[PDB]
């Protein structure tokens, strides 16, 4: 089971991901990294602005299914 979280893919681009309250956070960067066409390394999900450790669970920082996260990928000049 599990409900969708809100991954804000960069800016102006948002993609709904399906994860459970156990999805880690780099693991979170991996799935979001899949739809972004980039590696979870460059990609980085931060919920509500709190830098979460890649070893914490989805219900750890308080993400929980449904959570506005901010993915960030070191963007070369456009």
From Swiss-Prot:
Compartments it resides in: Cytoplasm, Cytosol; Nucleus; Endoplasmic reticulum; Mitochondrion
Organ and tissue specificity: Expressed in all subdivisions of the brain (at protein level). Highly expressed in brainstem, cranial nerve, pontine, cerebellar nuclei, indusium griseum, nuclei reticularis, strata oriens and laccunosum moleculare of the hippocampal CA2 region. Low levels were found in the telencephalon and diencephalon. Expressed in heart, liver, skeletal muscle, kidney and testis.
Description of the deletion phenotype: In brain, increased protein levels of p53/TP53 and CHPF. Cortical neurons display a slight increase in process fragmentation but no dendritic retraction.
Ubiquitin-like domain span: 3-78
Residues with PTM Phosphoserine: 67
PTM comment, free text: Auto-ubiquitinates in an E2-dependent manner leading to its own degradation. Also polyubiquitinated by RNF41 for proteasomal degradation.
Transmembrane segments: none
Family in the record: Belongs to the RBR family. Parkin subfamily.
Functional note: Functions within a multiprotein E3 ubiquitin ligase complex, catalyzing the covalent attachment of ubiquitin moieties onto substrate proteins. Substrates include SYT11 and VDAC1. Other substrates are BCL2, CCNE1, GPR37, RHOT1/MIRO1, MFN1, MFN2, STUB1, SNCAIP, SEPTIN5, TOMM20, USP30, ZNF746, MIRO1 and AIMP2. Mediates monoubiquitination as well as 'Lys-6', 'Lys-11', 'Lys-48'-linked and 'Lys-63'-linked polyubiquitination of substrates depending on the context.
Subunit and interaction comment: Forms an E3 ubiquitin ligase complex with UBE2L3 or UBE2L6. Mediates 'Lys-63'-linked polyubiquitination by associating with UBE2V1. Part of a SCF-like complex, consisting of PRKN, CUL1 and FBXW7. Interacts with SNCAIP. Binds to the C2A and C2B domains of SYT11. Interacts and regulates the turnover of SEPTIN5. Part of a complex, including STUB1, HSP70 and GPR37. The amount of STUB1 in the complex increases during ER stress. STUB1 promotes the dissociation of HSP70 from PRKN and GPR37, thus facilitating PRKN-mediated GPR37 ubiquitination.
Entry domain remark: The ubiquitin-like domain binds the PSMD4 subunit of 26S proteasomes.
Protein name: E3 ubiquitin-protein ligase parkin
Organism, scientific name: Mus musculus
């Amino acid at each position: 089971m599990g409900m969708i979280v809100f991954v804000r893919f960069n800016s102006s681009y948002g993609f709904p991901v399906e994860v459970d309250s156990d999805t880690s956070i780099l693991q979170l960067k991996e799935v979001v990294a899949k739809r972004q066409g980039v590696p979870a390394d460059q990609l980085r999900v931060i919920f509500a602005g709190k830098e979460l450790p890649n070893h914490l669970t989805v219900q750890n920082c308080d993400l929980e299914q449904q959570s506005i996260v901010h993915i960030v990928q070191r963007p070369r000049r456009r």
